[PDB]
């Protein structure tokens, strides 16, 4: 099977693990150890083709730059997550983008900008407009998700795999 290597990136508390666990296990998991990184593998039928998705749920603990870069080098696509309720997590996505680009050397690397916690509209700090503008500047798609309601969870994983399939 095609193996699509996906890496979750984003600053702390944005929903990397919650998104991953909703996708993997159809549960909203609210207390996942913030410092625990893990890998997940699932067989999925992508546009009618059985493939395997491998998800690296990063947790920020790899501070050694060479090792962090080695992990990103092995990734084929990235879900770059921020929380719509934390402006600083949106700002932080620039850093992950730069890190990925330094390693992958390809501005067209499969990459979605993911604004999570869309079920907390009353706590929004990041406008849809400014996130769409950033996605336009980077030539990536912007999708808002909720790990709590499952809104667009399958979409971001499947659309990232579609980019991996098309581009690689
Ligand atoms: N309401 C809401 N809470 C969320 C959502 N995603 C994550 N959370 C909560 O935000 C906290 C941190 O999420 P987590 O996935 O552990 O963040 P990580 O550090 O990026 O892996 C947890 O308490 C989650 O329950 C979401 O879409 N909606
Ligand atoms: S490794 O498999 O021993 C390993 C994987 C992931 C981490 S981390 O998620 O805590 N940190 C990390 N890893 C890759 C890219 C960025 C970041 Cl922050 C640590 C070890
Ligand atoms: Ca986590
Ligand atoms: Cl792992």
Curated annotation (Swiss-Prot):
Swiss-Prot/TrEMBL GO biological process terms: cell division; chemotaxis; establishment of protein localization to mitochondrion; exocytosis; membrane raft localization; neural tube closure; positive regulation of epidermal growth factor receptor signaling pathway; positive regulation of filopodium assembly
Regulation of this protein's activity per its record: Alternates between an inactive form bound to GDP and an active form bound to GTP. Activated by a guanine nucleotide-exchange factor (GEF) and inactivated by a GTPase-activating protein (GAP).
Disulfide-bonded cysteines: none
Keyword Oxidoreductase: no
Post-translational modification: Phosphorylated. Prenylation is essential for membrane localization. The geranylgeranylated form and the farnesylated mutant do not undergo alternative prenylation in response to geranylgeranyltransferase I inhibitors (GGTIs) and farnesyltransferase I inhibitors (FTIs).
Keywords associated with the record: Cell cycle, Cell division, Cell membrane, Disease variant, Exocytosis, Glycoprotein, GTP-binding, Hydrolase, Intellectual disability, Lipoprotein, Membrane, Methylation, Mitochondrion, Nucleotide-binding, Phosphoprotein, Prenylation
Known catalytic reactions: GTP + H2O = GDP + phosphate + H(+)
GO CC annotations, alphabetized: cell surface; cleavage furrow; cytoplasmic vesicle membrane; extracellular exosome; Flemming body; focal adhesion; mitochondrion; plasma membrane
Outcome recorded upon mutating residue 37 to W: Strongly reduces interaction with EXOC8
Binding positions (GTP): 13-18, 29-35, 116-119
Outcome reported for the amino acid change (mutating residue 12 to V): Impaired cytokinesis, as shown by increased number of binucleate cells. No effect on interaction with EXOC2 and EXOC8. No effect on cytokinesis. Decreased interaction with EXOC2 and EXOC8
Keyword Mitochondrion recorded: yes
Effect of residue 70 to A: No effect on interaction with EXOC8
Cellular compartments annotated: Cell membrane; Cleavage furrow; Midbody, Midbody ring; Mitochondrion
Motif (Effector region): 32-40
EC number(s) per entry: 3.6.5.2
GO molecular function ontology, one term from the record: ATPase binding
Glycosylation site positions: 35
Disease involvement: Hiatt-Neu-Cooper neurodevelopmental syndrome: An autosomal dominant neurodevelopmental disorder characterized by global developmental delay, delayed walking or inability to walk, impaired intellectual development, poor or absent speech, axial hypotonia, and facial dysmorphism. Additional variable features may include seizures, autistic or behavioral abnormalities, and brain abnormalities.
Subunit structure of this chain's protein: Interacts (via effector domain) with RALBP1; during mitosis, recruits RALBP1 to the mitochondrion where it promotes DNM1L phosphorylation and mitochondrial fission. Interacts with EXOC2/Sec5 and EXOC8/Exo84; binding to EXOC2 and EXOC8 is mutually exclusive. Interacts with Clostridium exoenzyme C3. Interacts with RALGPS1. Interacts with LPAR1 and LPAR2. Interacts with GRK2 in response to LPAR1 activation. RALA and GRK2 binding to LPAR1 is mutually exclusive. Interacts with CDC42.
Protein role: Multifunctional GTPase involved in a variety of cellular processes including gene expression, cell migration, cell proliferation, oncogenic transformation and membrane trafficking. Accomplishes its multiple functions by interacting with distinct downstream effectors. Acts as a GTP sensor for GTP-dependent exocytosis of dense core vesicles. The RALA-exocyst complex regulates integrin-dependent membrane raft exocytosis and growth signaling. Key regulator of LPAR1 signaling and competes with GRK2 for binding to LPAR1 thus affecting the signaling properties of the receptor.
Family: Belongs to the small GTPase superfamily. Ras family.
Protein name, entry field: Ras-related protein Ral-A
Organism: Homo sapiens (Human)
Lineage: Eukaryota, Metazoa, Chordata, Craniata, Vertebrata
């Amino acid at each position: 099977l095609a193996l699509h290597k996906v890496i979750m990136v984003g600053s702390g508390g944005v929903g990397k693990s919650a998104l991953t666990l909703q996708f993997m296990y159809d549960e909203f998991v609210e207390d996942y150890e913030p410092t625990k990184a893990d890998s997940y593998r699932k067989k999925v039928v992508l546009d009618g083709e059985e493939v395997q998705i491998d998800i690296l749920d990063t947790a920020g603990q790899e501070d050694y730059a060479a090792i962090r870069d080695n992990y990103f080098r092995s990734g084929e696509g990235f879900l770059c997550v921020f929380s719509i309720t934390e402006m600083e997590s949106f700002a932080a996505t620039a850093d992950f983008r730069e890190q990925i680009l330094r390693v992958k050397e390809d501005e067209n690397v499969p990459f979605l900008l993911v604004g999570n916690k869309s079920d907390l509209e009353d706590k929004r700090q990041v406008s849809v407009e400014e996130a769409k503008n950033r996605a336009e500047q980077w030539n990536v798609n912007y999708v808002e998700t909720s790990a709590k309601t499952r809104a667009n969870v399958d979409k971001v994983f499947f659309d990232l795999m579609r980019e991996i399939r098309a581009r690689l």
